[model samples]
Target chain A: TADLKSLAKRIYEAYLKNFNMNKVKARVILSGPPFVIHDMETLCMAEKTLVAKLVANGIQNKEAEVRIFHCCQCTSVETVTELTEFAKAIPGFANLDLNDQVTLLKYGVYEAIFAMLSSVMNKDGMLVAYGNGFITREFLKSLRKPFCDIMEPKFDFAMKFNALELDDSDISLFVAAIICCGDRPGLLNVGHIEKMQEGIVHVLRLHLQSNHPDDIFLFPKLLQKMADLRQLVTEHAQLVQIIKKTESDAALHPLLQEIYRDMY
Target chain B: TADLKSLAKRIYEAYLKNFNMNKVKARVILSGPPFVIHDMETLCMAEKTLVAKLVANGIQNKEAEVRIFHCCQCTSVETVTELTEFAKAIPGFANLDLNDQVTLLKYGVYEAIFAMLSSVMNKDGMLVAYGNGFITREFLKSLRKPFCDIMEPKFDFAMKFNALELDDSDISLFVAAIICCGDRPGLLNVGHIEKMQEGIVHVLRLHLQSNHPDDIFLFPKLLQKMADLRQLVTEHAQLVQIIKKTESDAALHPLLQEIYRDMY
Candidate 1:
């Protein structure tokens, strides 16, 4: 047990170091105008402008057979890649047996993806298809039944969760915590993996406490969001299954396809 | 990293040893009537019989200022005490810093308590404390607003969860997993704590897999229930706060009251 403790601490430090290195750069603040506008019209205009830019850029791969119309697909792929790199960078994760590494990624990637999605979410909706698409509750409901049903709950959760107003660093640690979660089925090194997650959580809690002294509920609320992410990812996996069965034209990336099949 | 791997395997083995020793003894099975009865009348009869015995025995202390009318209080106390003993018996738990042990218990105990509540619940209703009270949806709605509101959701979850038909040993492991959960705020040795939980979950999954060969969904379903229990406990905490402020005469046990204050 003493040996285990030292190992746990060492692994914990590795994860914290990984988190420190790989977290997405903070959103840069531009001092052009009084940008903090609460007006609905202004917010809508800003969303539209961002969506236009995303559409202009399109998918990075022009040689692809089909285009993804929604940001969900594009963001999911990008998020998956980011998380993959993030996992590779973590000494604790890299130390895991190769098979165990794949197992953790298979089960945990979507949870990590969805946790990051919170940064892009708002009460009105979120950017989809890169920045080109702005998805609302009504628009989501208008899609094919499986697609609509799958996303409405996520949008609903994201809308409510946006109230917490977490920044990039908080979101990073949250995503890291999600990735290192040991409870995923069929995982090995779970004891070791859980140690990394706990260390991340402890650090995240301290960060939230010091950063937001007026909001004591913030840390617990973030923990609850992690649980919420678990439930959401389960639904997301179910949706992927349904899509794989019915939507023959829906082009999933090779990596994501493997994740879907292996996770189930 | 190789050292970490060796350390992890050793820790895993230690936890497995602790889990093997600490699991509760299996309840005896008696061969009298065909125990597999789905008849409504028989279920109601069993409930009545159990309720009568609970009432006849009453609380151990005669000098108590108020008698609890709901089984929630009695069952919660017994659940808390049982969990305390279970935690004490876990070798890994004994090695935790005392404050960390208390912190984990303080935050996680209610969730564990409610997860075990399903063992006593039926689809029809559940036993309440009012000196042999059996509360249904209709009866609960007749109580004060928040009081009625709180118990209904718990009953709803309990009825759905009871479908799993977990035995005492299974329930003990599930309870143990809930207690050692690393996601709780302010935990120090989260790595150690989570290792213990992951070990319990691993054992529980394997046990469920072999025992319920046809029910492949059982283990994941049970894991999902842990998340649900967290939400339920959050709601319960809110209800307790309301009860404390509005219904001061509710007569919460000292330990329960402390949990409410410390947890919030």
Candidate 2:
């Protein structure tokens, strides 16, 4: 019992020591979407095929959708890459079996990205061009069908997620919990990774307790956010698959394609 | 241990035996929305105030909205009223203190209503006019700001909830869990209600384990759905509040307003 006690204590200490650096790092490194917008520079565009499509049919009026979708895919890859960096830095993540590390990350990346997205976005819109340019929700509302269909779900999630009023410190631990979740399918050592995730959940509760004293429901609500993100990514992947099929001419960022499905 | 085992067995049996009837009951009882439409006839319209607004602005093009919002509120009341019947029938629910019983349903109604709404609705749209007519996603897309704002959140949730592939039995137990959720504020006997909730959860898990032999994540995913429902109701209320403010001329059904906000 004492050994388990000490273990939790050590994990808490480790998570805390790293918390500030992680928050500062997140805001600095993870703030921007992959590509930039320069008065629609971004059709602002994801992958090689997407790029080629843009080159060929890039500026056609329907290009509004093609170009917009391209850049969103690119941002997902960028967001996910940073998520890998964040995951790799989790104190216990590096100790998992190499194969397990990959498995955990395969599922964890997009979930973490969506959680962090609540930071920059709201139901109406989000800032792009590295927080320098504005994108109106109505503009998205105007884009062509199928292509524009996927945008609203993300914003809907962002709205409630933002309402939770998490601090960067709280978010750091929350993102860590999301990244290390042992529940993802195909992990070689599920129990071990779950222990780490449990530790993260423990630390998160403490921080929220210390922080959100008025919110008796905060912890459960955050768990709900985790579930919402789970569905968000699933819905996202489904729509993406449809877009990839229906808009056969469209391109996904090669890595972004992998984010939601079997690696291509 | 034996008593608890008997309780689990009893509740599961109770939940199961009633399953077919509840499924039959839901389709017959809860299926039709509050009011029926005859090719837009229902708008063709919730309460006295909404009826008046539709009466006043009833055929202006924007009238499309007033009537639609009007029916949704009325449906909410109808749905909530049916939910009360479902809750009262739960094996342990009626046994709670008179005040606690009311408390459970007060918070439980909307959450339960939204959960069941999944059965009749989809990502694109839902059935109306007693499942005879269909609504298109694009038309809702054109709805006015704020009032039209709440529609998509419901559809997004309905899509994910549907994907879980729950059967009528699973939903019976699931909705039971949602209703007895001893977790809400203002309950007189928190621990007592929670024990009942815990039992419901136990039954839900066994039901899923038996029904979904290949699915490991189903239980947790369902828990996540519960969390999602909680957020959905919360977000629903927030928007409803703003709409009530902005559309001063708008009237909420006396009961519908109570569903989200403190009773009007």
Candidate 3:
């Protein structure tokens, strides 16, 4: 638990440094992989471990808001059903064919995210993380509407299907979500920031799909590495016992139980 | 031929003014439903879309560049044609997959349209008029690419699948084709211009796709009217004989042969 918790903390430190955090309420959203949950759990445990280790050594940052959201698996039936009903009230929308209705709901979710991101940007001391399936063909298909209309460079996200390889740095998550929060308040960081958003969007496609020769590459080998770590963490008997003892959902199983078993 | 030519010219003029004169220097590109060629031949007795109605005027506007390109049908040959060299070698394209390559060419054609539109805008002229099924769809599809990235919304061209239900105004054609020539000119005479373009794009769709609601409603009536005209025109012995002539190699059937003979 100590070792695992410390690792999560280390990731946060690395992430915080990546943004050159001078402000307080920044959010981190992770989309494009299921293992992002595992990654976040690992960080949570690591953060806990690091704090304890620091307390033993007399050091700790008492306030932290490292959060993670899974795109596909997270659902609240009541909330969604209510939302679906409410959305059906808009004039032309109420009469939409079923397929169009589904499309509208998907669009609604994206609008909700931008709305959330709007609020997340206003705070100076928060970290939010969200994610989606990185390699699922269906997942990528569902992403089309949101990617082109509201995302960076304002075009179809097809150019990145060039079969090229890439990594996390090439992704557009932070720049798109962050800068949408009025990233620079107004001093003219606009052009550079906008390009960053576009480039990140470029990476999102590269990481999920194959590459096109004309596109900028953004592939990642992190998934295999992540899978291996999940297996290793789940095998630990002490972690399993702690997860069971805590009365947390044991079915959270390989992810929450093992990687985040140490988080207090 | 004289009466037929004059009728065609009037139709073309109505189409030009109706479409806000967006056709000029004539980079008329076609995309979308692959079956449009049949409709074009059936409706207008032209081997190519818009050629008959347009050629006489196009020849007159010697400064206008008119070219028809078919992208939906273009394919990479199995012979491993050296990139776009298999085609007409439009520059700045190579090594892209089939889908990406097609979308690029589609954009290239639109860039030509944009350039044409730019020139028309400068001279305070409207150059585009009634475009056929494929061309209209391609333009709309391109707008949806990646980011609803459409410029200059002269009209909304959402097609109705049923053609017979069309209103009288739906018989509209483009107003004109214009090239800007970089003069930064503005044409103030275009009143009711937007509505006209919408009507033109709509009727053009029905003209080519009889399955559309408007076609189902109006096309039967249109055919009946055309039949009466055909009878009167047929009494003119020389014209009827010319209209009756046909080539065995031509794919069209007998009724179309009569229309072709009349138009020729």
Candidate 4:
């Protein structure tokens, strides 16, 4: 318990400093139930946050649309860097081969991003800017068909994922499980990565048993979200392929392009 | 043998007149060893046909690009109508409920089209104008990325399928087997359709037995082609989705759009 708790605490701490998704922290305990998320009221929208428009299709102006897409991609590139830091801060993640690090991060980041986003999402829209600003379903519904189609499904998945009410602790181990996956194409040290993934997933399963005793199915439920996460990534690549073909004026963030180089 | 051969003759006659894919005919016999496709020379390239340009991406003009896509879609519309007619020519196909006819044809036509086209395909290209015109693999390689990506796999599948060396008799029954598929979504009379499909496949198995005595695995090989055909269809839809998103100037043909309505 002490050793796994050591691993969990380190990851949970890394998750906090790396993701500024919210300021409220889970109470890490010396004893008692694993950790406590303070105040259900913390789930409410923040008072001081501002909305940076979520959609590139928000305006009909072509040049403006291109700029908006660039902003959206640049924001993603930043999150990706933060995500890479979160993985590195965990034990054994950086110990894997350097290319394996890129392979794991490339395939795993979207799942981690969406899983983290699920924390602050509802049926309507996701909370961005650290639980401050919200993008409404109303705004999402108004985008062009290509953009709307992709956004709508993310909301749908996140809304269902939020119903489980997993805290930061559960997500940290889960995101670690994603990055250590051995099954992605182009992996070299597969057995080593699999060992890490199994350790992380095993810890996640035990944590859920203590934290969510009433929900026997919650562990598998989380595992299934990883599958759905891969599908969302596929759908995301499809839209990007369209954007690249159609929008010659704007370019994807170089990091985003590198991560998704397997596509185009 | 007599009754199933009766079914095969009707379909083979309809295919020859309707397709005009070649004037070369299989000698569908009154006796001994089913149908005989005469002469290896029939697979040779045609001497006298003109190349109607194969790609919308061939010219740089935007409106012209749109027009070329329209022409491509219109040609597909013609093939689809012919495929539906072939399905209707089958005994139990027209007897199914009207919407079931559409449902079967909708899912089944691409498999049938690819199966029939395999007769004319080599690793390098396909024969398009009834043994007259050819579209080389070189021409296919020169198209835009999205278009080229879709066409290459079709050639790959057709090249493997052509290795089975199925004749018109084999293909007509093979196509009938495709249209009679009962597993499609939205089917009401599934069991009835399956019975028709089983009967057609049963006949196809016996015909192949007489036609190629040494080939033991041809039945399931044909069925596996049906699986790959669906994959090819999916990859085709993905490319079309990219096209629709990127090319606001070009519209898909109404019937093609209707057939693929399950997508965006």
TM-score of each: 0.42, 0.46, 0.19, 0.44
- List, residue by residue over A106-138, the lDDT tens digit for candidate 1: 777887766655555555555443333444555
Model 4 lDDT tens row, A1-264: 898878888888898888766313312111112211122222121211232343224454344335435645766777798998899866688899998998989898877777766665566555554333455665656555545565666776676576667887888888888887788999999998888887887677677776776554466557656766786788888888888887686577788888888842
**How does chain A of every candidate compare to the true chain A by TM-score?**
0.70, 0.78, 0.23, 0.82
lDDT of 2 by residue, A15-102 (tens): 4332212333334433543333323444343122123333433445345677577656656665665566556556678888999887
Evaluated at residue A161, the lDDT of candidate 3 is 15
Regions of candidate 3 where Cα sits further than 4 Å from its true position? A1-71, A75-178, A181-264, B1-264
Report how far off residue B36 is in candidate 2 (Å). 13
**Tens digit per residue, CA lDDT, model 4, B47-79:** 100112222134543543353355456547667
CAPRI class of candidate 3: incorrect
By summed lDDT, the worst window of 10 consecutive residues in model 1 chain B runs over B25-34
Q: Which stretches of candidate 1 lie over 4 Å from their true place?
A: A1-71, A88-91, A129-133, B1-264
For each of the candidates, the C-alpha root-mean-square deviation to the true structure, in angstroms, is: 21.6, 23.0, 24.9, 23.5
Candidates, DockQ: 0.02, 0.01, 0.01, 0.01
Which prediction has more favorable lDDT, 1 or 2? 2
Per-candidate Cα lDDT values, in order, are 0.58, 0.65, 0.28, 0.67
